[PDB]
Amino acid sequence: MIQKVITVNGIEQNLFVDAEALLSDVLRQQLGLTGVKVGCEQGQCGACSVILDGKVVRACVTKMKRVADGAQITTIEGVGQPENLHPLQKAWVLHGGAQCGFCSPGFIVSAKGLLDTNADPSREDVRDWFQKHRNACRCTGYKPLVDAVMDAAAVINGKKPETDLEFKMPADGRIWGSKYPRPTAVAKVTGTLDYGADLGLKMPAGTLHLAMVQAKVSHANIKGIDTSEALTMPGVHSVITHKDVKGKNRITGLITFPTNKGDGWDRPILCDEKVFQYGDCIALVCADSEANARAAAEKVKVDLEELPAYMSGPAAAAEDAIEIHPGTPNVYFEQPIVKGEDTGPIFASADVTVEGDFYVGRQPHMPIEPDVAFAYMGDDGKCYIHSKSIGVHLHLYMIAPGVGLEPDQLVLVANPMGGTFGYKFSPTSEALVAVAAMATGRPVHLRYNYQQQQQYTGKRSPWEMNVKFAAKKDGTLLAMESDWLVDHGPYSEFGDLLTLRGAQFIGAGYNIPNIRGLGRTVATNHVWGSAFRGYGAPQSMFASECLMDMLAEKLGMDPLELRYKNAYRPGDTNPTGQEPEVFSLPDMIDQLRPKYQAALEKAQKESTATHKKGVGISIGVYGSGLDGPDASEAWAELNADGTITVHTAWEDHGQGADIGCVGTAHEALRPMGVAPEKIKFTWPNTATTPNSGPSGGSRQQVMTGNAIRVACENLLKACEKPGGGYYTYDELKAADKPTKITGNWTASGATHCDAVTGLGKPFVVYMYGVFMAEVTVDVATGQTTVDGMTLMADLGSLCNQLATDGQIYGGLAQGIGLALSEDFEDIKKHATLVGAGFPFIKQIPDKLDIVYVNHPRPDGPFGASGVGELPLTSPHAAIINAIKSATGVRIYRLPAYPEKVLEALKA
Amino acid sequence: MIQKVITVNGIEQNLFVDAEALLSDVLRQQLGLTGVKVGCEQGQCGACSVILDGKVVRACVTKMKRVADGAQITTIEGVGQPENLHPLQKAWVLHGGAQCGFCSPGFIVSAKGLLDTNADPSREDVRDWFQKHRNACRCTGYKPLVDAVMDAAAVINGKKPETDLEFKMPADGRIWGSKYPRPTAVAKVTGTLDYGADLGLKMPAGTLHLAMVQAKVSHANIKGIDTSEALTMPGVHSVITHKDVKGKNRITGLITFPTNKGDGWDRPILCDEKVFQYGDCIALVCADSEANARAAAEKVKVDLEELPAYMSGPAAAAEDAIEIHPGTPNVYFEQPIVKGEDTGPIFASADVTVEGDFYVGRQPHMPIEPDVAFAYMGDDGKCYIHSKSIGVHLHLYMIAPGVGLEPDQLVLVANPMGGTFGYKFSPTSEALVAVAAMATGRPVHLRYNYQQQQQYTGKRSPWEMNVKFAAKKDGTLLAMESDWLVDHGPYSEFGDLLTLRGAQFIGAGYNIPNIRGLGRTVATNHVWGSAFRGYGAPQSMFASECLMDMLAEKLGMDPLELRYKNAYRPGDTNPTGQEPEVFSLPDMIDQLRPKYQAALEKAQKESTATHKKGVGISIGVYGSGLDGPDASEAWAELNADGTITVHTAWEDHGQGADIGCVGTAHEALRPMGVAPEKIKFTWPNTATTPNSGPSGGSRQQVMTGNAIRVACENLLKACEKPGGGYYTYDELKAADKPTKITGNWTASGATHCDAVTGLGKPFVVYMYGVFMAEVTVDVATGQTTVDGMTLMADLGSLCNQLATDGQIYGGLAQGIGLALSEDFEDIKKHATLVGAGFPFIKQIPDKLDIVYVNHPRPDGPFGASGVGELPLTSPHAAIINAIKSATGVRIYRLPAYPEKVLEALKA
Numbered sequence A, B: 001m002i003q004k005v006i007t008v009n010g011i012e013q014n015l016f017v018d019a020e021a022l023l024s025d026v027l028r029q030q031l032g033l034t035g036v037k038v039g040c041e042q043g044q045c046g047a048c049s050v051i052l053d054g055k056v057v058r059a060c061v062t063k064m065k066r067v068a069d070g071a072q073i074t075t076i077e078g079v080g081q082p083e084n085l086h087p088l089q090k091a092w093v094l095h096g097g098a099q100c101g102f103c104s105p106g107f108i109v110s111a112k113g114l115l116d117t118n119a120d121p122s123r124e125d126v127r128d129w130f131q132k133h134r135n136a137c138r139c140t141g142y143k144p145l146v147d148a149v150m151d152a153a154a155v156i157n158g159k160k161p162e163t164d165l166e167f168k169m170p171a172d173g174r175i176w177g178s179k180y181p182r183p184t185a186v187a188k189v190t191g192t193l194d195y196g197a198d199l200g201l202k203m204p205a206g207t208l209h210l211a212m213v214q215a216k217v218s219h220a221n222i223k224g225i226d227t228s229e230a231l232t233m234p235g236v237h238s239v240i241t242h243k244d245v246k247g248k249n250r251i252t253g254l255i256t257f258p259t260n261k262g263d264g265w266d267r268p269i270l271c272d273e274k275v276f277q278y279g280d281c282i283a284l285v286c287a288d289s290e291a292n293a294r295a296a297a298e299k300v301k302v303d304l305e306e307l308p309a310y311m312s313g314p315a316a317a318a319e320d321a322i323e324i325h326p327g328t329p330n331v332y333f334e335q336p337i338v339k340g341e342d343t344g345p346i347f348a349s350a351d352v353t354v355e356g357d358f359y360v361g362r363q364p365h366m367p368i369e370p371d372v373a374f375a376y377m378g379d380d381g382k383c384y385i386h387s388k389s390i391g392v393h394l395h396l397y398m399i400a401p402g403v404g405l406e407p408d409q410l411v412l413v414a415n416p417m418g419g420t421f422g423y424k425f426s427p428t429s430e431a432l433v434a435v436a437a438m439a440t441g442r443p444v445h446l447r448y449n450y451q452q453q454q455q456y457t458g459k460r461s462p463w464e465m466n467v468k469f470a471a472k473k474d475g476t477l478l479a480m481e482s483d484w485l486v487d488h489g490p491y492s493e494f495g496d497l498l499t500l501r502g503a504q505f506i507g508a509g510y511n512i513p514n515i516r517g518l519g520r521t522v523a524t525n526h527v528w529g530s531a532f533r534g535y536g537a538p539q540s541m542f543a544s545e546c547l548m549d550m551l552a553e554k555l556g557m558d559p560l561e562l563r564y565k566n567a568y569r570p571g572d573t574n575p576t577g578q579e580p581e582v583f584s585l586p587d588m589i590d591q592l593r594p595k596y597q598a599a600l601e602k603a604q605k606e607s608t609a610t611h612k613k614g615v616g617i618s619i620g621v622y623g624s625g626l627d628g629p630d631a632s633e634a635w636a637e638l639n640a641d642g643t644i645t646v647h648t649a650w651e652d653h654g655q656g657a658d659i660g661c662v663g664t665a666h667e668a669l670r671p672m673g674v675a676p677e678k679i680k681f682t683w684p685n686t687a688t689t690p691n692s693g694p695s696g697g698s699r700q701q702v703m704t705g706n707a708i709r710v711a712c713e714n715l716l717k718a719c720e721k722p723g724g725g726y727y728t729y730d731e732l733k734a735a736d737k738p739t740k741i742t743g744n745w746t747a748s749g750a751t752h753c754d755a756v757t758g759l760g761k762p763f764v765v766y767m768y769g770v771f772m773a774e775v776t777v778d779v780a781t782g783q784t785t786v787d788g789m790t791l792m793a794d795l796g797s798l799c800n801q802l803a804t805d806g807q808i809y810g811g812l813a814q815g816i817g818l819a820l821s822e823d824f825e826d827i828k829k830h831a832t833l834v835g836a837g838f839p840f841i842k843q844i845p846d847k848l849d850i851v852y853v854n855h856p857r858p859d860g861p862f863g864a865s866g867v868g869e870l871p872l873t874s875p876h877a878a879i880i881n882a883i884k885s886a887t888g889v890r891i892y893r894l895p896a897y898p899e900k901v902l903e904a905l906k907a
């Protein structure tokens, strides 16, 4: 051990450390500076950035031997605190740079290092700095972060007053539609919002820390588990196996479709008889520390009989393949789509037909924060779970039978969380921590490392697709045929529903009167499927939007004009036979057209012999809602102090559940003159918040926003005075009148798509958009650079423009990754951010352009649709269409890795 | 477990706690708020004061079940921080209220609670508030704390500007003699100075926490130790016994006198063959936490044969008493004093003689911070110990042979510490933690609780005394006889030296030409003797100063005038035959006389039938130095940045080693114009600071101040330019000239007192003072209230008046405790602050008056003497003399408990 006397955030510390200890651990654990966030633990994400002697360093890869006596360290806590915010922190708040907020401390500390060396950076200087310091963000698309740095620099330089970093009220009021900052921003930018790992460090000494004993093969029969050596290791309390599970030891898919051939009870909590994928949790070591738990988990011996594994959909779907779940065929679900007339004769007599085979793969979510959860037995006898769940009520019912609790004896709570992008539509760690809390009686905490985040959380499910169009010479679509095979890994939850998305969204955007297609879901031994932002649309619309460009090419038609010819107009129906609710695609195309023509001219002018530029288009469509007559509930409560709490279970991935609640309630409460800072939101809790439903399907603004609107309207009625005006809290309580008022809303007149035909009215609100990608391909290497993205977006009405702009930039960036670099195919090589192709800042252009073309929705609150998934519906189709424009090469199977593009260029 | 969402220092915390957990532990351990200090752990000291929902509560006795959802908590960290200080914090700094600083956070938080309920308190309101909230201080005597509250209130109330709480430079400069604040004050008042327990919470996860297995009888032969059950308990690593000690397993007294009958190797590190006192450490449990170590220590079984214990000096000294240390007589040392002519004939022919039997007991130091230390093996192979040692070099040599290390392989460092008052002149925990670090190879940390602080640290040693005076009718002293028996408990360290203090200080202050006396040191089984502020003078001068009043009464003379007749004047010698170096007692008496006469008149006027007032006087004298030609060393270093570091091992109990260094160096450096904020001090470290010696014997200002002065003079010479002026660092380094310059100083011409006669010149500088106590005795109950204390003090020249005023107030308060309430006689009943008679604020009068009558010392730096022990030399004699004045009752055996006084009143 060594004594080191240094200065941390301006104060002398007398530190006692191991010279080999990591600075991140010393700062977080020894000094309590949980504003130093840790994600990857491998020097690749920048979340743990600190200033050490004037240099920005990643604390997770800096050992204490590199910290000299007398060193100066600055963490986010030393940059500024609430009510003493630094200009960078104020700028972040104003520009909406904290979505999940997990990267915000590291970017802000890194940016302070930049400005202390270059006071007046260009935007490109800022981008270069964040690239060099590996500051990674999965939520924002980086542009808001650069905007904030530039604004802060101007203030620090004396070019504008610091008061200009504070939000100016629009002064009619109306925060609806404004850039009002989100309530959680201050905590995020100061490192004072405790995420699950932070909470673990602040739990009491009795708390047991867990480590998973995981399968290191993809498929096996389990013969036994020997925990004897592990039990003798330092700090070890016990080892938990399936024998300690008090219920069925299975997670239920809960809404497994009747036509599914499986019963939905396929997924174990702790593997008993079989390993189904690499990473499956077979046992839990409980110890005094994460480090001691992990060391002991390495010594647990699992006796296995390895079985041949099916590592893709086509392999598992073969007629003679062995059943992974004995008694259920590997192909466990099929969804037909049958619209209009038989397509064979129409293809036979059509002027033009096209066909293609396409593939979209196993995209990894890659939040900066790896999965984490904890549980404990309450003094009330209930089991409490605090996790990254984005559907607390949903997950309660998915796990309760398996862990052996009645629903009233379990409580699920959503912690603040550093992004999910859908992986948390699935249970991950909740049942594991519940089992351990119940077995030990003690609080338990489980943190995944980044390799476990990659290998052992769910993934976008690969689709192998064939799609065909028949059309007239003038470009009018006549018919479509479609076939898709969905590789869902071994666990069925929501896989049939995902497959149904192909019936809804292959070919969406256009009038197609005659459709014949079939989707199939197959179990495999690769990673299980969890929702990923877009949930079936990124697959579906990659196929159809690429095929639209192929049709345009075969007709000799411009691809934007082909879309204009066919885009939804009154009288048309979507693939499930439903009329669209608004008709904004022609408007959006007309407004994009001159910008597309200018982009084509620029690409021609600026291309060189080696660096070929191109422009690509696509349309995106997605529902806002879960299928059928979805619903939500909210409670609007006048508090004694005159504030109003709007109680919901609107789960915050980081997208803005806080600001969505506040902005929607503010608008509904305007007749009573309620200031926005007087409106409070509630963190999701199954015991004390209503069943607002999960934050999936781009649904909360519509469903929960309408429930909030109705609850607030009902509170206004409850407060209205005879003769005009409103009663105060004191006046209502004096009269023994209610102050906590319910509202509900249902999407009545949605219907679930039929099991035989695929027809129905699954959503009452959709999101519509038109993408344009501008790219350069180096034809010597096959490397593509995306130089610009544009989204024309119809969101109906904006609740909050900082929220919606940020959602769109973040989705566009994930689209660039999906198009060019991302996959989870190689279990080890793709288990790091860099290995799996995470988009660092230079891969995302600074030119991300939005044009809102909002057509108010009949059923949305104040006319709003959702936004969350719109920007990931088809940006990757626009990018691949742009590579084709540039070079003549079409990539059919994502991603467009440089060698793949180069092979195609040279063929 | 329960979730509680509350606000701490203005920020929402999402807390996860056990409902039975203590708020102090949650705040310190879970949230890292080590500004919440914990001392007693029993609700008696206020150090852990926090504001909870507007009320000041002791966090150590507040369970989490009492903290409601939505509660508001404020700790010192929420009051203010460095560079954002609250008016209370600024006022504390300005008024010198942080000496050790351990109570400062709790007083400041408590004071904020006061001012939030009563904005304009009277001084008595402030005192009432601190009494009710149990805010305890052992260093300051409370008056500076009240001064700070009043000044802060005036600012908060708008009556004076906040800038008036900032020190104003005297503007000739000269910080010598000023009220310049001490360097450590800001850290102390913000809770950002880490004391040993704080450091333990900030040590790494590998650190083992120790608990002592202690004797629960006073005297025994040990037959065996069974650790088997303890080893099976949660978190236990190992149990350490004497078998794990690698050296002699004895602490050496190091300077045991040749005429001592013992060899000085009597004290074990870990008991092997015998228990010598209740509390002796027999084994150390090493575990993952203090709580788990303590639980397991309860299960270690020690097989003992209890022996009869000698629990007082007279019992152990009996001719037939059994030897506690077989082979050494219990009475192991005698010191005669033989000055002038045989006293028997002089007593026989004297006009007047008096005699008395007196007792001063086992006073407990009662710092607010209980003992704590840690150790580790460095990467350099050395064993490092960080403790409350106030003599790091001394303790290194006392423990090295016992732990089995050569002196160059051990390093001792003084942590910031919350007071000692002398108990840390002894080793306590240093050898224990060294043994454990060496045996395990791991860092180890040992915290005593308050009962262990009381039972198992050393004590003031009781003296049984007989003293006699012979005098002329005019009051001239002719002769003195003295006998004293010193109960030193079982461990000999410095007991012979303490006994020699009786030869030096019984009768000090007066010319006494003829003296015959004998001191004896005896080993007992009560607590071992460690220095307590005054070290022999409180015993010695209680006897002689009470006997002076008895002589005055027998002569019919005023007791101040009797002292005036006999006080040192040129030509006189002290009891060891040495001439005083200055002659300030007549001056001080002449300046006190009218205030004494006015106090007598007030006492007569304000007395009632039941509440009798009185006034008492005493003189105090003590050396500044350790006996003989004491010495020190300092290094003065010009740093690259133009600051100057003054390297010393001046150990800071809290008295002001920091400001003593800075103020002394500033004065010495004036020719070069060095600003005080450019002068740095060094924490004591045996490897990297010079052997300045221990902070005992009121010596550092004289010895180390002179060494600092000389080092700084030498640095000036090293910097002097030819032709005038001074070279800069850069100029010196360019010339390859030295920048780190040594200075040494020795008290040459001191001599050690002779072993046969007691004669010698042991110190070259003494401290001189005259006390006046004003008291009221309730004759119905025997309760005494001290209404005022005055000290006339000759300190030569003041280095810093905030430091010296505070030293005097603190010593006067300890004198009130010694006189009226304090002891450590009952091993269990006296093991709490309240049980042992700790003086809370109402027991210390607000009227504490100092008059400096400074006579510059020939050998002191800039004329200074010490101060530390002067105010505890005889205040308790003045108080008992005042009880006698008031009531006619003399208490001979301290303390003056109410029942004891009442028995005497009614006899």
Ligand code: PCD
Residues within 6 Å of the ligand: A099, A100, A139, A390, A419, A420, A421, A422, A423, A424, A425, A531, A532, A533, A534, A535, A653, A654, A655, A656, A657, A658, A659, A660, A661, A694, A695, A696, A697, A698, A699, A700, A701, A702, A795, A796, A797, A798, A799, A800, A801, A803, A804, A807, A810, A864, A865, A866, A867, A868, A869
């Ligand atoms: N018009 C409009 C719309 C909307 N908004 C906003 O925006 C947001 C969003 O919304 P929405 O759309 O409704 O959604 P939500 O439900 O809330 O959420 C969810 C989503 O969200 C997104 N985004 C995001 N972001 C972030 N940051 N992070 C994340 O993680 C995420 N994730 C993703 C996903 S995947 Mo799934 O579960 O697969 O189905 S679905 C999803 C919010 O805040 C709101 O409020 C506005 O403002 N306006």
Ligand code: PCD
Residues within 6 Å of the ligand: B099, B100, B139, B390, B419, B420, B421, B422, B423, B424, B425, B531, B532, B533, B534, B535, B653, B654, B655, B656, B657, B658, B659, B660, B661, B694, B695, B696, B697, B698, B699, B700, B701, B702, B795, B796, B797, B798, B799, B800, B801, B803, B804, B807, B810, B864, B865, B866, B867, B868, B869
């Ligand atoms: N003239 C003069 C003198 C002095 N000063 C100051 O004052 C202080 C003190 O000093 P001195 O006297 O020199 O002393 P020191 O050595 O440093 O110290 C020690 C002491 O100190 C005291 N005080 C105190 N305080 C406090 N707060 N705390 C404590 O704990 C204590 N302890 C106590 C004791 S006990 Mo022995 O160890 O028994 O012998 S001794 C003793 C310092 O700060 C200094 O600097 C000044 O200013 N001036």
Ligand SMILES: *C(=O)CCc1ccccc1
Residues within 6 Å of the ligand: A255, A256, A257, A258, A752, A753, A754, A755
């Ligand atoms: C979609 O064809 C069927 C959806 C469903 C119906 C009943 C229960 C579960 C899921």
Ligand SMILES: *C(=O)CCc1ccccc1
Residues within 6 Å of the ligand: B255, B256, B257, B258, B752, B753, B754, B755
């Ligand atoms: C005082 O009479 C003797 C002091 C002494 C001399 C030598 C070594 C130790 C102590």
Ligand code: FES
Residues within 6 Å of the ligand: A037, A038, A039, A040, A041, A042, A043, A044, A045, A046, A047, A048, A049, A058, A059, A060, A061
């Ligand atoms: S770079 Fe340190 S946690 Fe990712």
Ligand code: FES
Residues within 6 Å of the ligand: A097, A098, A099, A100, A101, A102, A103, A104, A136, A137, A138, A139, A140, A368, A418, A419, A654
């Ligand atoms: S806000 Fe950057 S990772 Fe979420």
Ligand code: FES
Residues within 6 Å of the ligand: B037, B038, B039, B040, B041, B042, B043, B044, B045, B046, B047, B048, B049, B058, B059, B060, B061
């Ligand atoms: S009153 Fe709490 S530590 Fe003393």
Ligand code: FES
Residues within 6 Å of the ligand: B097, B098, B099, B100, B101, B102, B103, B104, B136, B137, B138, B139, B140, B368, B418, B419, B654
């Ligand atoms: S300053 Fe109050 S206990 Fe030391």
Ligand SMILES: [Cl-]
Residues within 6 Å of the ligand: A890, A891, A892, A893, A894
């Ligand atoms: Cl391809």
Ligand SMILES: [Cl-]
Residues within 6 Å of the ligand: A897, A898, A899, A900
């Ligand atoms: Cl490649």
Ligand SMILES: [Cl-]
Residues within 6 Å of the ligand: B890, B891, B892, B893, B894
């Ligand atoms: Cl008595």
Ligand SMILES: [Cl-]
Residues within 6 Å of the ligand: B897, B898, B899, B900
């Ligand atoms: Cl009593």
Ligand SMILES: [Mg+2]
Residues within 6 Å of the ligand: A085, A086, A087
């Ligand atoms: Mg500022």
Ligand SMILES: [Mg+2]
Residues within 6 Å of the ligand: A511
């Ligand atoms: Mg038509």
Ligand SMILES: [Mg+2]
Residues within 6 Å of the ligand: A825, A826
């Ligand atoms: Mg590959």
Ligand SMILES: [Mg+2]
Residues within 6 Å of the ligand: A899, A903
């Ligand atoms: Mg190749």
